[PDB]
Amino acid sequence: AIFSDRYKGQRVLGKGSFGEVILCKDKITGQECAVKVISKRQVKQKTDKESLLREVQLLKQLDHPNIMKLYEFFEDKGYFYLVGEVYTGGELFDEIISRKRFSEVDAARIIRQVLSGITYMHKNKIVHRDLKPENLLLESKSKDANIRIIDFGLSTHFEASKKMKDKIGTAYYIAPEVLHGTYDEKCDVWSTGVILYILLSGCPPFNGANEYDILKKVEKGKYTFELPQWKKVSESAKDLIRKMLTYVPSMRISARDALDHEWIQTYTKEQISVDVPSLDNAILNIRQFQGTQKLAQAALLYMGSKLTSQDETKELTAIFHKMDKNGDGQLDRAELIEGYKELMEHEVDQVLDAVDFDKNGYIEYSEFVTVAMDRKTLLSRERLERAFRMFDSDNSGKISSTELATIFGVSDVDSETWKSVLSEVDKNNDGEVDFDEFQQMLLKLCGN
Numbered sequence: 001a002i003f004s005d006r007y008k009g010q011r012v013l014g015k016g017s018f019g020e021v022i023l024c025k026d027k028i029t030g031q032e033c034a035v036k037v038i039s040k041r042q043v044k045q046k047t048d049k050e051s052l053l054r055e056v057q058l059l060k061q062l063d064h065p066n067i068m069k070l071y072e073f074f075e076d077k078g079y080f081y082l083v084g085e086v087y088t089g090g091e092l093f094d095e096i097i098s099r100k101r102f103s104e105v106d107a108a109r110i111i112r113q114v115l116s117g118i119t120y121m122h123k124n125k126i127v128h129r130d131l132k133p134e135n136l137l138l139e140s141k142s143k144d145a146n147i148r149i150i151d152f153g154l155s156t157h158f159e160a161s162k163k164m165k166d167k168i169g170t171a172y173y174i175a176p177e178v179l180h181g182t183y184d185e186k187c188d189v190w191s192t193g194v195i196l197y198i199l200l201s202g203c204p205p206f207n208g209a210n211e212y213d214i215l216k217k218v219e220k221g222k223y224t225f226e227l228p229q230w231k232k233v234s235e236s237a238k239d240l241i242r243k244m245l246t247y248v249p250s251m252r253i254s255a256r257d258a259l260d261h262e263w264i265q266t267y268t269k270e271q272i273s274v275d276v277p278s279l280d281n282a283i284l285n286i287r288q289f290q291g292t293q294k295l296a297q298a299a300l301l302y303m304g305s306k307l308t309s310q311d312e313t314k315e316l317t318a319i320f321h322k323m324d325k326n327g328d329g330q331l332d333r334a335e336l337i338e339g340y341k342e343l344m345e346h347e348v349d350q351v352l353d354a355v356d357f358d359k360n361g362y363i364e365y366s367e368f369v370t371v372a373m374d375r376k377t378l379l380s381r382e383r384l385e386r387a388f389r390m391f392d393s394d395n396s397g398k399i400s401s402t403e404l405a406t407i408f409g410v411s412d413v414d415s416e417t418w419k420s421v422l423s424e425v426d427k428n429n430d431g432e433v434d435f436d437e438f439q440q441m442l443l444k445l446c447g448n
């Protein structure tokens with residue numbers, strides 16, 4: 001059984017953990033689904049194929065409304081294809097940052113869903129390990145929509161990449177016992193407790209200027225409710241957080257018992273019978289937090305994309321050159337289409353639209369190369385601008401040096417490195433950059 005016999009790719013949904021996620025369609029029934037493609041080359045497996053096959057078969061039999069449904073598994077020489085249900089409501093936090101009000105009740109309802117899914121998976125001896133906001137998808141972009149946890153069980157069978165683009169934000173949520181090697185299902189209670197802490201305060205409990213600093217705080221395991229905005233939170237919420245963030249896992253509360261907690265019982269009642277002051281500073285803080293995480297991620301993806309497009313520009317010109325038997329540097333539509341296929345049609349026609357509107361004759365392939373690549377980088381360049389604009393909440397058009405330190409810290413760009421690049425971009429900078437200057441910094445940070 002081969003993937004492509006059954007499913008056609010329709011559009012890309014993003015990169016997730018361990019590989020690329022594509023919206024696909026059953027060639028017969030028309031059913032839409034999401035497929036995660038895991039490159040055996042790029043991604044090492046942890047276990048034997050028999051363990052993987054067994055766990056997959058188990059996952060297919062399981063069903064819970066807060067757990068992503070897996071439908072099917074395929075393999076060829078180069079890839080694993082994991083087929084499941086597609087959710088269209090986006091990441092939980094990207095929804096939360098658009099709300100005007102957010103109370104403990106809203107936090108409780110979110111966290112009861114997470115604990116419910118986790119409790120069910122732990123019953124089946126499946127551990128997540130990498131539970132974080134990015135793994136909480138909504139069935140629709142609405143405060144009322146159901147949460148689906150994605151990626152349960154993957155970490156048991158696949159080794160995580162050490163590329164920073166892949167691991168942004170991971171440090172905040174990882175259980176200390178995972179850092180040290182001996183872990184079990186209790187690590188997912190810790191990650192949920194970190195998420196709960198963030199929902200209620202807008203700030204991670206273990207925080208720091210870069211990956212090492214954050215991890216050092218997680219390992220020490222010390223955190224407080226020192227911040228001002230913890231005064232607006234019930235002692236009951238805090239009590240559950242203490243139990244979920246208990247250091248020694250055998251002393252840490254279970255997911256089952258966290259569902260039973262007074263706070264969950266009391267605040268997830270259909271009928272709101274308790275006070276619901278909007279946690280206004282927490283929303284402002286969560287927005288700052290999400291914006292920063294998205295801009296750091298976008299920055300890394302932009303630099304990644306500029307390197308990829310550099311190679312591909314070279315390859316494409318080489319390819320067209322071989323095909324250019326005339327040596328006149330002009331090709332027809334047909335030749336351009338095969339050349340672009342060779343690199344790895346409607347995209348060729350969009351390029352020719354710009355290059356020769358009338359299509360009177362042949363195309364300067366050099367002009368085609370530019371447009372092809374100098375457009376194809378759009379999604380990363382516009383996503384970068386969108387993240388910058390979003391981060392810039394006051395519409396100042398600038399990011400301060402303090403904010404750059406944060407953004408780059410999160411991004412593992414060395415402090416002295418980005419300041420040197422800043423100096424090259426603008427000798428007379430005054431501790432702030434506009435979008436173009438920021439983009440100039442990123443180009444210089446990836447050898448451009």
Ligand SMILES: Nc1ncnc2c1c(Cc1cccc3ccccc13)nn2CC1CCNCC1
Binds near residue numbers: 137
């Ligand atoms: N189910 C989904 N629905 C929509 N988008 C998704 C996913 C999935 C998860 C997924 C898809 C297909 C198969 C799977 C098999 C095992 C585990 C997870 C799988 N990733 N993404 C992409 C978004 C992009 C924005 N950052 C959050 C993730």
